[PDB]
Amino acid sequence: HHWGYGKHNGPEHWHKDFPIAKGERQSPVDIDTHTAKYDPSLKPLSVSYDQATSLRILNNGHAFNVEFDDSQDKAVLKGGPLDGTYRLIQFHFHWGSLDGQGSEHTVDKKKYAAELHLVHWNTKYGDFGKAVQQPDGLAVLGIFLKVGSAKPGLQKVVDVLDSIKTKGKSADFTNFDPRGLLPESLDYWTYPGSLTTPPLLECVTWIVLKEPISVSSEQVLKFRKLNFNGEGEPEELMVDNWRPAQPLKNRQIKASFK
Ligand SMILES: NS(=O)(=O)c1ccc(CCNC(=O)Nc2ccc(Cl)cc2)cc1
Ligand SMILES: [Zn+2]
């Protein structure tokens, strides 16, 4: 009886195994655009993905992860609210059963169809497992997806999904360029938070881009054909793998833009 996204094991149950679920800096949150304060001390984000080396795509039973070789300083996030250098390790998405839900963060209570998470770890801690134990260990770049025009840079991901339908399946996934998933503007909101899945560790500087990317209905429909279950088990479509907004508590969301 492990955690997941159902009546019996979904987000409202997680606190029993992971009491930090009711902690002081949990994610995601609703971004109230009127109360987020412009912070002129924030820097432009530096996204340096020219040398990113993708290796593999994995269905982990909760989402799919596109994994990168993070054994060198090949793809890094810097600047913005961050001190130092954060290395890209993987990206994944959260999405809905329908276009009206799926994102984890919300904007004035608006839910997007999906949300991309580009996960980076602080190189001062030497590796990912050590970084998640630190309050400034991770930087996750969050990008909203809306349904409209196709995102050409996503289609290589969409087309490999048939080969990792079920939990525990993986496939070679080299030479994927995540620059193709970025919107035009790097305007962002930022706040201190957590992993949005167990173990819910409070180790994340969240950087959420204001501008969504557009994907086609056919693209997101293919996400919704994945399975939470393993091969040969009863089919449970991988949809609604998002955690709802959590209490903001004593935190301030800062905007990089006027
Ligand atoms: N949805 S998200 O972007 O917030 C997000 C990003 C990354 C993860 C990482 C999962 N991996 C992990 O939990 N690693 C770990 C945990 C405990 C020990 Cl003891 C050792 C290693 C989860 C959520
Ligand atoms: Zn995530």
Layout of SSEs?
Layout: E1 30-31, E2 37-38, E3 45-48, E4 54-59, E5 64-68, E6 76-79, E7 86-95, E8 106-107, E9 114-122, H1 128-131, E10 138-147, H2 155-160, E11 170-172, E12 188-193, E13 204-209, E14 213-215, H3 217-223, E15 254-255
Parallel strand pairs: 1-8, 2-15, 10-13, 10-14
Antiparallel strand pairs: 3-6, 4-5, 4-11, 5-7, 6-7, 7-9, 9-10, 12-13, 12-15
The protein binds 1-(4-chlorophenyl)-3-[2-(4-sulfamoylphenyl)ethyl]urea and zinc ion.
Subcellular location: Cytoplasm; Cell membrane
Cofactor: Zn(2+); Co(2+)
Binding site for Zn(2+): 92, 94, 117
Through-space gap between termini: 47 Å
Going by CATH, what is the homologous superfamily?
Answer: Alpha carbonic anhydrase
**Top-tier CATH class:** Alpha Beta
- How many whole angstroms does the radius of gyration measure? 17 Å
According to CATH, the fold-level topology is Carbonic Anhydrase II
Overall, the morphology is globular
PDB class: lyase
Keywords: Carbonic Anhydrase II, CA Inhibitor, lyase
Assembly: monomeric
Entry title: Carbonic Anhydrase II Inhibitor RA11
Concise structural overview:
The chain is mainly beta. The protein has 3 helices and 15 strands. It has a single domain, classed as Carbonic Anhydrase II (Roll).
What are the defining features of this structure?
binds zinc ion, 15 strands, Carbonic Anhydrase II, mainly beta, binds 1-(4-chlorophenyl)-3-[2-(4-sulfamoylphenyl)ethyl]urea, 29% strand, 258 residues, lyase, monomer, 7% helix, two-stranded parallel sheet
